[PDB]
Amino acid sequence: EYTVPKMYLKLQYCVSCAIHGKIVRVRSREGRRNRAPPPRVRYNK
RNA sequence: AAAGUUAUCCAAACUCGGUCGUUUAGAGGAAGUAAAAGUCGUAACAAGGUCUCCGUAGGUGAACCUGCGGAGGGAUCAUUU
Ligand SMILES: [Mg+2]
Ligand SMILES: [Mg+2]
Ligand SMILES: [Mg+2]
Ligand SMILES: [Mg+2]
Ligand SMILES: [Mg+2]
């Protein structure tokens, strides 16, 4: 039995390249002030 | 005791030079405002199609472009061992 190793990276972007690669996107005026991380899907349908 | 006369003082006026202020002529050079049915491009306002702007330095017909350090008045108030 073998376990393939992992790889660890830390990418970091300017804002101009952040929303062209769809890392983040425009939010509404009221929804802007919400800094909780998005809830990742834990059921996947 | 009059004309006249000697030496100081108070001094108008003229001549030459210096200095300050106002007004005015000038070949040529370089800007601003307005008036246009002008010529050549399209820098900015939408991610204005290379995100925009600030200080500094260089370059190009013209708007402008590029290097170094900033700012968000941005196109992100946000990504977990
Ligand atoms: Mg003159
Ligand atoms: Mg003249
Ligand atoms: Mg431009
Ligand atoms: Mg802009
Ligand atoms: Mg704005």
Q: How does this structure look, described?
A:
The chain is low in regular secondary structure. It contains one helix and no strands. The longest helix is centred in the middle third of the chain and has 4 residues. It is flat, with a radius of gyration of 16 Å. It starts with 14 loop residues before the first helix and ends in a 27-residue tail after the last helix. It binds magnesium ion (5 copies). The structure holds one RNA strand of 81 nucleotides. The PDB classes it as ribosome.
Q: Tell me how many strands there are.
A: 0
Largest sheet: none
Tell me the span between the first and last alpha carbons. Answer: 31 Å
Q: What spatial form do the alpha-carbon principal axes imply?
A: flat
Number of distinct helices:
1
Small molecules in complex: magnesium ion
Strand content: under 5%
Structure classification: little secondary structure
Radius of gyration: 16 Å
Order of helices and strands, N to C?
H
PDB class: ribosome
Keywords: thermophilic eukaryotic ribosome, 80S, rRNA modifications, nascent chain, ribosome
Entry title: Thermophilic eukaryotic 80S ribosome at idle POST state
Name: 40S ribosomal protein S26
Would you kindly provide a brief summary of this structure?
The protein has 45 residues and is largely without helices or strands.
Topology summary:
Layout: H1 15-18
The structure holds one RNA strand of 81 nucleotides.
Family: Belongs to the eukaryotic ribosomal protein eS26 family.
Protein name: 40S ribosomal protein S26
Binding site for Zn(2+): 14, 17
